[PDB]
Amino acid sequence: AAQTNAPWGLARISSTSPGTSTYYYDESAGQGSCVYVIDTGIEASHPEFEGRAQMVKTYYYSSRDGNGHGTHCAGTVGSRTYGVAKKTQLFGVKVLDDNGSGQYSTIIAGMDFVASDKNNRNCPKGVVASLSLGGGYSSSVNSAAARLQSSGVMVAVAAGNNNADARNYSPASEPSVCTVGASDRYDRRSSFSNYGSVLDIFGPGTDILSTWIGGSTRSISGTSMATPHVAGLAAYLMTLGKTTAASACRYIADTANKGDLSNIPFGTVNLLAYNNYQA
């Protein structure tokens, strides 16, 4: 399939050079997979989700996304126009309040919920969890993420927007999960992107157009924006049978555009998420 005039990040992950405008992808588009978006919520009523999104859990008085951040992320995973896996099933776990904050205790609870709740859901091609969040290092938060990965979910986490080494942030610093840095449309490391040996992959994260609350759209920046590119790619490759949840992160790194990014500090991977689709 081809999405003409796709956002630049979608076009990026289906090309070998920067500067293209079409997103090539296999038409299965992640059908039969599920991605949990652990965030502020998802405006499931948005026409861009086509009823493929639903909230499944909240830790606040509302399940709605009064912020927009979760919706933007869920849109990059699997919205019809801005998403990588256009046929995927999106589940919403609201661990973050409407200001984008949440306690680690609540975030931990959210992850353990996903590890169990996937057994309530028909995801025959596998299960992914996108975690556009983080803070300072905590082993409890790291183990929470590693538990989720062990239960059989491909876990993708943001590296953080501090322009520092991700080893001092969680769940970014957990080795067994897929930690995602951010790049821009000219293959530069995003000025805010964390870096470090704990990174496994980069994804588009500067000026990313996606869904927003109120049935609208906007363009924002962050490793929070790169993470769902990888979450979506994961679900896309798992629908295709090319990898498993346990293997997806390493496979995406095996099959990435190598060496193409600029301002990668020495010791950080130079790997850019790539779907190697051959139309």
Swiss-Prot record:
GO terms for molecular function: metal ion binding; serine-type endopeptidase activity. Its cofactor is Ca(2+). Ca(2+) 2 binds at T16, D260. Binds 2 calcium ions per subunit. Keywords: Calcium, Disulfide bond, Hydrolase, Metal-binding, Protease, Serine protease, Signal, Zymogen. Its EC number is 3.4.21.64. It catalyses: Hydrolysis of keratin, and of other proteins with subtilisin-like specificity. Hydrolyzes peptide amides. It is an enzyme of class 3 (hydrolase). Disulfide bonds join C34-C123, C178-C249. The active site is at D39, H69, S224. Residues 7-279 form the Peptidase S8 domain. Ca(2+) 1 binds at P175, V177, D200. One of its GO terms (biological process) is proteolysis. GO terms for cellular component: extracellular region. Hydrolyzes keratin at aromatic and hydrophobic residues. Belongs to the peptidase S8 family. This is Proteinase K. The lineage of its organism: Eukaryota, Fungi, Dikarya, Ascomycota, Pezizomycotina.
